[PDB]
Recover the amino acids of this structure.
């Protein structure tokens, strides 16, 4: 790949990389030339994903349960046996009665902090003036647009994550660790598979999106690749919508 | 109190009103002519506050622990036997957790998110029936949530859970503003910088710490109680009637 977008010789980790947006990103980074580790809650499904993604580059699954402070140290430990450094961290592991709020806030915010905190040593092993280490957090336009629907825990959790990302960016910038947010609108995911399969329900749901369609997997891949590379080297603390104009 | 700022005949509830910013707001609304209830965990301290605040108008304490869903439900029930409507809800109860980045805290986060975000949602959720009984075209019911400039500014203190939790609060407030607007229920955020409270008293008593903290603020000083009171009153009255979804810093220019 052209040097603007090439990730050859870079080592990447994508949390929640076994399906949906995380998997779209992992495939892109592999296609760009990076070595890509992935992790998810389900170790078997994650290893199956890694195997399938091995048709695109060097991909390995690592066991991780990020919904705990022990889980974040375990991932850092397991990665450290496999690599001396980490160049690219993509935090996608997320989720969507107020009894469910505690869990939404845990996975979307706190677990991302813990994951970053424990990986700081090997991120610092990588970070330099010539090429900063990259942290890319997957947020949501639900954390910015007032046009929520239901799911009143989700939007606020992503806003917490966007703000956490901004604070980290500011603190880490002198250490040559860049922190940025991709803020997706609607993209294909097994959660909304029923909508995607039925053309009537698909176009009906796309009426809320100014572009009148869902995002494409290659759009997510493309953006993640550029953010991890030359296009993203001079940015930190950004929150970038990829959302069909929803945020307007 | 001039018609523009008068809250005479209005019924208010300030959560976390026993001390700090809650107390400043409670006194402010009382002086504006509002009938104001206050709630906190410490039953005795809250009752002592209400008595002290009774010098300004009809103030009454309702002890409540908002750190669970059941507590918000009880508060709604307790206020319901006391009043037939609620004109002004001020959501002030909140907390910080400060510790080194690379150390331990994870239980700190969970407590911070529950009070600053989740408990505020359930609070409004449980009180919507009283809010709707108040709400009309000629005068909307008012929700006022206390956020923080920590949720706006990237400038990191300690307390890595606090900023994000307050940002979640601001977004929640905006979403609720959009949904309830057609029912004549306005929802707005006051995002303070430094104000004197129990949480900050250690800085305030050390001349050196206070100097360095004041120097980090563009206006070079902490907020005054009367400034918080004036803004809360304004927001609850005519100045806030055509407002919803706003997040308004009162921070000495810290947001810049
Ligand atoms: N001070 C600042 O500079 C600043 C800046 C930005 C934002 N804030 C926010 O503004 C709000 C004001 O707090 P403060 O620090 O100024 O005053 P504070 O002295 O800390 O008192 C806060 C109030 O919250 C109540 N409270 C705590 N936990 C509760 C619970 N589980 N259920 C019901 N009530 C509870 C307290 O009652 P008890 O006494 O019984 O515990 C008290 O009345 C907070 O939400 C804070 O995060 C403050």
């Amino acid at each position: 790949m052209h040097p603007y977008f090439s990730l050859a010789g870079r080592i990447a980790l994508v949390t929640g990389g076994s399906r949906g947006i995380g998997q779209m990103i992992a495939q892109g980074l592999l296609e760009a030339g990076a070595r890509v580790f992935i992790c998810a809650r389900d170790a078997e499904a994650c290893a199956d994903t890694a195997t399938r993604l091995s048709a695109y580059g060097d991909c390995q699954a690592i066991p991780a349960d990020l919904s705990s402070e022990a889980g974040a140290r375990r991932l850092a430990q397991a990665l450290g046996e496999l690599s001396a450094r980490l160049d690219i961290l993509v935090n996608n592991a997320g989720t969507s009665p107020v009894s469910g709020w505690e869990k939404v806030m845990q996975l979307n915010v706190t677990s991302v902090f813990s994951c970053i905190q424990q990986l700081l040593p090997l991120l610092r092993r990588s970070a330099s003036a010539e090429n900063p280490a990259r942290v890319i957090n997957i947020g949501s336009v639900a954390g910015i647009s007032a046009m929520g629907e239901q799911a009143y825990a989700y939007g606020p959790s992503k806003a917490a994550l966007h703000q956490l990302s901004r604070m980290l960016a500011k603190e880490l910038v002198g250490e040559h660790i860049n922190v940025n947010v991709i803020a997706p609108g609607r993209f294909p995911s097994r959660m909304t598979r029923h909508i995607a399969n039925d053309p009537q329900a698909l176009e009906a749901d796309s009426a809320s999106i100014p572009m009148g369609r869902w995002g494409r997997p290659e759009e997510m891949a493309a953006l993640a690749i550029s953010l991890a590379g030359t296009a993203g080297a001079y940015m930190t603390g950004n929150v970038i919508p990829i959302d069909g104009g929803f945020h307007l």
User: Anything to note?
Assistant: Chain B has one domain: 1-256. Residues B 15-22, 40-42, 45, 64-67, 92-94, 115, 146, 148, 192, 194-195, 197-200 surround NAP (CB under 6 Å).
